[PDB]
Amino acid sequence: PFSGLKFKQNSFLSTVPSVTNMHSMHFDARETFLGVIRKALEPDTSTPFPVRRAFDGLRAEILPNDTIKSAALKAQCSDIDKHPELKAKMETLKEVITHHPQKEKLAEIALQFAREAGLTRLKGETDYVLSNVLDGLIGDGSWRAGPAYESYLNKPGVDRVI
Amino acid sequence: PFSGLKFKQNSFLSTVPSVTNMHSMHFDARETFLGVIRKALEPDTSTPFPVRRAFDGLRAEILPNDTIKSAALKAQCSDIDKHPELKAKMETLKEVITHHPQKEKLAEIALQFAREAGLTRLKGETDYVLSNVLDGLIGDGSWRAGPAYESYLNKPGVDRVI
Amino acid sequence: TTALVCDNGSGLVKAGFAGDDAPRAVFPSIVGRPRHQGVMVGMGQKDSYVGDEAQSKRGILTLKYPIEHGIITNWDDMEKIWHHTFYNELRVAPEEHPTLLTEAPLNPKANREKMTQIMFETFNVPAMYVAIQAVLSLYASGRTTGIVLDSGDGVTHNVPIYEGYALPHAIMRLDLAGRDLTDYLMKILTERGYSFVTTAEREIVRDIKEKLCYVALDFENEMATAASSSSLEKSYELPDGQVITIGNERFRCPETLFQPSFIGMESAGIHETTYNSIMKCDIDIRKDLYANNVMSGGTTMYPGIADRMQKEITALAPSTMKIKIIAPPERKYSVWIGGSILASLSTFQQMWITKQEYDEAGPSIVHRKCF
Amino acid sequence: TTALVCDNGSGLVKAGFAGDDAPRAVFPSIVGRPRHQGVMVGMGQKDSYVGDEAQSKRGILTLKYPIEHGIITNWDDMEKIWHHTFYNELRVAPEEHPTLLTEAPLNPKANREKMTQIMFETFNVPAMYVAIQAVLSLYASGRTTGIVLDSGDGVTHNVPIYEGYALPHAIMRLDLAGRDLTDYLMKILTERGYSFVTTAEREIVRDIKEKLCYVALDFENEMATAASSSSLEKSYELPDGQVITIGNERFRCPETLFQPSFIGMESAGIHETTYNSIMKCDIDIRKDLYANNVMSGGTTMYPGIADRMQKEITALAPSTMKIKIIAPPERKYSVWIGGSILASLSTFQQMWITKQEYDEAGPSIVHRKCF
Amino acid sequence: TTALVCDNGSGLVKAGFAGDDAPRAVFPSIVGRPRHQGVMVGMGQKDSYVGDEAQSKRGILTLKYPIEHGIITNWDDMEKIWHHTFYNELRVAPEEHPTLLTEAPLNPKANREKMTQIMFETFNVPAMYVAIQAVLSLYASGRTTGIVLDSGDGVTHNVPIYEGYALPHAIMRLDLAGRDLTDYLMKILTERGYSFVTTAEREIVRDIKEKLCYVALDFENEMATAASSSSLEKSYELPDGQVITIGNERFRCPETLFQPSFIGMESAGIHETTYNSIMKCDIDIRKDLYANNVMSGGTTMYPGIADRMQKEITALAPSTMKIKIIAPPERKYSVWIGGSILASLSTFQQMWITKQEYDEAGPSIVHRKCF
Numbered sequence A, B: 001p002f003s004g005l006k007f008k009q010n011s012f013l014s015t016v017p018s019v020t021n022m023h024s025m026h027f028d029a030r031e032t033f034l035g036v037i038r039k040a041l042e043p044d045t046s047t048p049f050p051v052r053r054a055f056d057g058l059r060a061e062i063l064p065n066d067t068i069k070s071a072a073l074k075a076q077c078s079d080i081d082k083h084p085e086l087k088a089k090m091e092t093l094k095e096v097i098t099h100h101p102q103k104e105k106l107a108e109i110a111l112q113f114a115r116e117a118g119l120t121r122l123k124g125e126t127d128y129v130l131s132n133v134l135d136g137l138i139g140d141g142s143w144r145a146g147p148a149y150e151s152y153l154n155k156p157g158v159d160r161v162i
Numbered sequence C, D, E: 001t002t003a004l005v006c007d008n009g010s011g012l013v014k015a016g017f018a019g020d021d022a023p024r025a026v027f028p029s030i031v032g033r034p035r036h037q038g039v040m041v042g043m044g045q046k047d048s049y050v051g052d053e054a055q056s057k058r059g060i061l062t063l064k065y066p067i068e069h070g071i072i073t074n075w076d077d078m079e080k081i082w083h084h085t086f087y088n089e090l091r092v093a094p095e096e097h098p099t100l101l102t103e104a105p106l107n108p109k110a111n112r113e114k115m116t117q118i119m120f121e122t123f124n125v126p127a128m129y130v131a132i133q134a135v136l137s138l139y140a141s142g143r144t145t146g147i148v149l150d151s152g153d154g155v156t157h158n159v160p161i162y163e164g165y166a167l168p169h170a171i172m173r174l175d176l177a178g179r180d181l182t183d184y185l186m187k188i189l190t191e192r193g194y195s196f197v198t199t200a201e202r203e204i205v206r207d208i209k210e211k212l213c214y215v216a217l218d219f220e221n222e223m224a225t226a227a228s229s230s231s232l233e234k235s236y237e238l239p240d241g242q243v244i245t246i247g248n249e250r251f252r253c254p255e256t257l258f259q260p261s262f263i264g265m266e267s268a269g270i271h272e273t274t275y276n277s278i279m280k281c282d283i284d285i286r287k288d289l290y291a292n293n294v295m296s297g298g299t300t301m302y303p304g305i306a307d308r309m310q311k312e313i314t315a316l317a318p319s320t321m322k323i324k325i326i327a328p329p330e331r332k333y334s335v336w337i338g339g340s341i342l343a344s345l346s347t348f349q350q351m352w353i354t355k356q357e358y359d360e361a362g363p364s365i366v367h368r369k370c371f
């Protein structure tokens, strides 16, 4: 449905923050991961116009720029059944990011935001956008468990070593 | 005469040995104190060239690197009156180290080599290099007496205490 | 009622009202994300600094530019900087005053189409207009003819223009500019050991460049002065306190404008692409272009740049007739000031792009407004 | 309702409620078993004294510390001391109030993982939080920037931090601290014959140290004052009655902070690992770190320590710009007081580690809470 | 008659004769002063050990490197190590054989000027020549084109070069290298409690690093293997006898090459500054640079480093065309072996720097010999 549309390569490398940045306690990882997905889905100008402004027109009510619009976006994410026409337009974007040409480089960085920044600390209770965008990049959706484990205690030998 | 010449800060901190090192009986404190003064007077590369290789050219016949050259250097220090042209070029370097920008940090460490390593155990009979380089860093030259005293015996009270 | 004029500078966003002599606020076009822990609890907010507050706080930020080579790349950040212009530093409602964006010639169409689409559908300005950089600069001259060496932070370009009429085929444009100066100055400081690596140091390289670097009148004979290095070197205090000094690298960096092979780009220098532009122009105008050369843009604030190109174009011109280099003392703001004039003309209020004619036109309306 | 803050001191456990100015109870972190016959029949109970009652009864005990070098070693005794905090001296139910443990940076992970596992599965506190030592101390400063010479009893460390944002790669840490001072003071009392051998005497060495030892402004020139030993010596009454006196050993012991080769560890002194930390920091912050140096921790209560490092960092800094040493008169309690502030902030009650989120997380939850 | 080639390694001095396949002697670039009493009377001599004898005797020495970041700092010690090469281990008279020093690109000029002045006016070699590191490594390839990821102990750098002709503006260089790996490995051993502090332990950290650390193919998915920590851990016997073990810290240390934010330096990884170098190169060469990527230097002996960057540059390249990573099994000695070839060419004996042309030239002669 959005055929004839493409993106420029490596469009998001300036946007992904440092690892010491995302180890912050005042780091609301939602609006900076979406801000990566916003920049990563910036359509290349080689796409023709009538498919460009439609796909951009789908974006502004899905991935807004202002911090009050995305905070307003989460408001209907609690009752996504009662908002079908925006909920139905979301899986279109999920279909687009499924065929994204740098999907693996996204999917490598997408769950790098999940562990180091704690993006997926709800694990099944995250809202509708962070659910399917990760499910757009991670096919099996196996991100539910796995970042929580960190191999806490094991001492196969001697005590403190000096 | 050596105007427009400068050094980098803290250039000698790697060179000054530990205190337990300089409490050695096989620690000939001359060639390791000169080796500090050699490194501490390393000219910074921001100095221009024709003042750089002249001041470096004064050094190689004053502060050599090999242990046989400095041992040869002490040989004319016994008859420094009969070698005027090198004796006259020494006070030029004494003038340089007088205006050294880290003189106090040198002069703090310069007599730290004097006590802990026993550099000044001749006290008036040291040769010409260790004389004026210390006199370059210590202005009044009051290093003759003072490191020898250590406050041997005083018992203002009771005997052994268990 | 009044109009705003806001030169989208490639390095420094210059902005202000129409009819004002000086631009109201000039701030560097820098957006910056922080890059560290933030273990404080209160000061961890404001996750993207932009402008002067990113300039002062530059030690903990990854300073990135939204515009490179005159082409607006990161449109997400470019909203953030324009929101900082209107609300945060001009304190004006954008929905009430008309704006006037400016841009380089020969940039991509989508740099223009998106720029108007992000102006109406985001800021809802009443009317906008996009101007070529150098054709604003003749309004700053108060003179209607002559080519312009408009060298900015991101791109340099020549727009030859006779009285009224421009020469569109003879517009030449080189991407060598102040960032390519700054990046080459970073390369040649490493020869003296002053290794300045990351973007915070890339900022202070420009402070070295704008305070020290002059361009030489005769490059080889003044290089030979640096052989007998006696009085060439100055010395610059870094923000930490330790001081540098710099010798032949002080003038060898702005020779990139004249020998672009120093940064290895295969081109003619800006003295020669000047003459290559005037040779492209028709033969009657060439007498008047030689008498009218307007230096413009902040890169051309190098001392000696007027005395150099007056010498060097004379080497290329036929020597029987005179050359002039019109270098005013306001070259840094010349694009804005001419932009401040053009919005104030009474014959211009029909030349805008209004919203009521935008809505049936779409973003291609700016291609039928001065190309 | 209220929170408890209990700094796990390496030498002195400091504890109290949130929002209180002074910590409620400060007692030395000493557990001690007796070591003799006990031929009395009634007083033979209480086979492990801890805290002040181990301090007063120190003559018949083997006084051992549970924490060395900031690393909690004996976890069996470390339960015993925390049980003494909550029940025996604070008299509060730990299951009702949230706690806030504090620890050094760059300690092992199991020092943190076991510490939370022994907090929930033993004391059943509602919510806990682990803080880096020195980042609490800026809250005691009421100032959001500057490095901290936080020298405790067990470890010293520098946490450089700009406004909000810390520098995790530039955190430096040396194990030289007050016990390494005390052990070196025991070595140099033997030069005057005052042989203090075992742990009861190791306690009274610290009473010699905290009452007498000052650090010299200029080490060599004030050593030369001890050559003409006229007014340097003071004299200290031991608990038995016989009196000692001490000369050059009074100031030569705290020079271990500046010459770590005295105890033979190959390192830079705390004046130099200060400067080595600021050189690791980025170049813009260095101007502000030099104006903001917070002495903290009980080791830095030596008289003259501020006048020394202000002199000595000036020797290492570029002299064109100023240095400051912020040494408040509450440096002994600065980690607690800043800890008392941080728990009292209204923006902090979402930053805890609750039990209901612990149970699906396990002890690795603290690694995703401020590292 | 024959020439010597002696790669001034930042970590390991590699040396040998011209035309030899293997370098004659490889010893670590360590000079070391002792740091203790020496109450023996006979063995107190030789007050500065250097090389392998400093390596074996490393427990009583302060091991310091003369070269950091590819820049020769301590010129007094750098004489001592070169005197150890020629006399002590090669046993050749330096006045008879020509030498060939090697160095990194973009190092300071005084690192080159002093290096030739300390070569003639101290060792009196007949003729010398200074070569860029990576351009020697193509001679080891036997192939005349392709960029080189030459990552040494002290610096990594990319020298893109087409057949014959190099790209001087596209030479990129990062200071992240094996010491920055070793220093970060020391930081992350403390998370498991293995506190290795001083320079003798900094040596044995490198023995941990070179024997154990591999780089991961996919960092996050193989980090998740360390969550179910079953088969990742190996275990290493220290020289005293007590054994360590190491889990996720084994592969997390060489990820500093790819995420330089781990040591907090703001840069692109060596996978990305590869691609940033090739984007700087002209558009025809880019097809051939992608087919020709030479890993070189001892840092790139990590297992899996070829399989990683072949994956990761493929993520950055346009996927329509192939990538190759030429990782020979002699990458540790590739700079020497290509240096051994270049001195043996019959077309090279006019390319030296002879003493008879030095004497009227001075130390600036090397700036007119291959820059």
Ligand SMILES: Nc1ncnc2c1ncn2[C@@H]1O[C@H](COP(=O)(O)OP(=O)(O)O)[C@@H](O)[C@H]1O
Pocket: C008, C009, C010, C011, C012, C013, C151, C152, C153, C154, C155, C178, C179, C206, C209, C210, C211, C297, C298, C299, C300, C301, C302, C332
């Ligand atoms: N007074 C000055 N002296 C030297 N260089 C200057 C001076 N002012 C500005 N520059 C250089 O010019 C550049 C500013 O370019 P500018 O004209 O602002 O670009 P734009 O036209 O895209 O806004 C900066 O990189 C700066 O280094």
Ligand SMILES: Nc1ncnc2c1ncn2[C@@H]1O[C@H](COP(=O)(O)OP(=O)(O)O)[C@@H](O)[C@H]1O
Pocket: D007, D008, D009, D010, D011, D012, D151, D152, D153, D154, D178, D179, D206, D209, D210, D211, D297, D298, D299, D300, D301, D302, D332
């Ligand atoms: N007033 C003082 N004068 C000198 N030394 C002191 C003073 N107060 C404490 N100390 C030393 O400081 C140490 C206490 O440090 P402390 O604040 O307990 O560190 P921590 O709280 O991290 O354990 C003790 O070893 C003591 O020797």
Ligand SMILES: Nc1ncnc2c1ncn2[C@@H]1O[C@H](COP(=O)(O)OP(=O)(O)O)[C@@H](O)[C@H]1O
Pocket: E007, E008, E009, E010, E011, E012, E013, E151, E152, E153, E154, E178, E179, E206, E209, E210, E211, E297, E298, E299, E300, E301, E302, E332
């Ligand atoms: N087999 C190996 N496995 C892993 N790392 C190695 C190996 N061999 C060497 N290294 C690393 O490479 C460094 C040697 O690099 P070197 O050849 O000295 O570079 P340069 O000669 O340019 O200084 C050592 O410090 C070590 O850390």
Ligand SMILES: [Mg+2]
Pocket: C009, C010, C011, C012, C152, C153, C297, C298, C332
């Ligand atoms: Mg400008």
Ligand SMILES: [Mg+2]
Pocket: D007, D008, D009, D010, D011, D012, D152, D153
């Ligand atoms: Mg404490």
Ligand SMILES: [Mg+2]
Pocket: E009, E010, E151, E152, E153, E297, E298, E335
């Ligand atoms: Mg190498």
